[PDB]
């Protein structure tokens, strides 16, 4: 019933966090 | 909220915090005029 878990992720530093609001349309991304 | 917490950290376990996406509102810590400890040797309060 649960599929939103996480594995390990010791999170030593994680000093940057950008939690923010975000036939199918072709999703194109440039990184 | 950080400065007005209910529990203060101990001496042996010093709590270290890192600040991101924030601004230095110096006026809030400067309006009380309680800067009794002014041993600012090597710096100036005008070049802030
Ligand atoms: C991140 O900061 C923590 C603070 O306790 C430190 O232990 C850790 O080594 C740092 N990791 C880095 C610099 O990526």
UniProtKB/Swiss-Prot annotation, chain B:
Domain of life where this protein originates: Viruses
Glycosylation, residue list: 4
Effect on the protein upon substituting residue 7 to K: In strain: Mu/B.1.621
Subunit structure: Binds to host ACE2. RBD also interacts with the N-linked glycan on 'Asn-90' of ACE2. Cleavage of S generates a polybasic C-terminal sequence on S1 that binds to host Neuropilin-1 (NRP1) and Neuropilin-2 (NRP2) receptors. Interacts with host integrin alpha-5/beta-1 (ITGA5:ITGB1) and with ACE2 in complex with integrin alpha-5/beta-1 (ITGA5:ITGB1). May interact via cytoplasmic c-terminus with M protein. May interact (via N-terminus) with host bilirubin and biliverdin, thereby preventing antibody binding to the SARS-CoV-2 spike NTD via an allosteric mechanism.
Role: Attaches the virion to the cell membrane by interacting with host receptor, initiating the infection. The major receptor is host ACE2. When S2/S2' has been cleaved, binding to the receptor triggers direct fusion at the cell membrane. When S2/S2' has not been cleaved, binding to the receptor results in internalization of the virus by endocytosis using host TFRC and GRM2 and leading to fusion of the virion membrane with the host endosomal membrane. Alternatively, may use NRP1/NRP2 and integrin as entry receptors.
Name this protein carries in UniProt: Spike protein S1
Protein species of origin: Severe acute respiratory syndrome coronavirus 2
Taxonomic placement: Viruses, Riboviria, Orthornavirae, Pisuviricota, Pisoniviricetes
Chain's gene name: S
């Amino acid at each position: 019933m649960e599929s939103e878990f996480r594995v390990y992720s010791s999170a030593n530093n994680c000093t940057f966090e950008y939690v923010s609001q975000p036939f199918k349309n072709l999703r194109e991304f440039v990184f | 909220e950080v400065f007005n917490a209910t529990r203060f950290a101990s001496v042996y376990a010093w709590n270290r915090k890192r600040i991101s996406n924030c601004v230095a509102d110096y006026s809030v810590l400067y309006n009380s005029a309680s800067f009794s400890t002014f041993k600012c040797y090597g710096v100036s309060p005008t070049k802030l």
